[PDB]
């Protein structure tokens, strides 16, 4: 899953 930013 990708980081928030």
């Amino acid at each position, epitope marked *: 899953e*990708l*980081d*928030k930013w």
Partner: antibody
Amino acid sequence: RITLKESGPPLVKPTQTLTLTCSFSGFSLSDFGVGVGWIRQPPGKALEWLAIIYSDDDKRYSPSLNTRLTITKDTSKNQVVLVMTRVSPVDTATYFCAHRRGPTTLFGVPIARGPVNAMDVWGQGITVTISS
Amino acid sequence: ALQLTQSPSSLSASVGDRITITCRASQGVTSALAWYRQKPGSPPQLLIYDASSLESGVPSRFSGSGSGTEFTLTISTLRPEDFATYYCQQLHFYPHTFGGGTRVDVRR
């Protein structure tokens, strides 16, 4: 100046629940993009990422620790809490909480997002041992 | 998950030496990478954020380069406080992986 500090019990027995508290100052978890994360360090070992929570209450956990962790924040009393259910001696480590900058905002806008790529300020850390 | 391998694990050096540590990701992490120095008894200290951005307060002898899967940390002139352990961290993916660390001790 930003500061974070970990508080909680130095000893916990196996199967028990560990509640760690991160009290900070110098920033608010109502501030844009800001996050507070937890990282532990077993005696003599590498850092292990545990979780992070942001000002919008967005939460992320370590996949391997997921079922046992709960992260939460109290915006009003600058406190981020980490609850770790049913611990074992492997949970024995130094627990750090740390600040993560949010994107740079210019008036309205986010011109810069490179600053989120790090945990810039860390707390002293708290040592927790798990023994029955 | 995502793998952060540091090289080398241990490094022998002397004051004034120029050293370089590398952090290798199993998948591209763009520029979302941080370097930290940790002295025994103390918490990690941010040196480099966003792969190359020098953190405020940190000495200019610290430098970071690379993107994607290859990252390097360079200490141009080793000072006594650099005899410590270094860590890299990836913040492009969850979970925010840390490398295994690189111990820098006094060479003899």
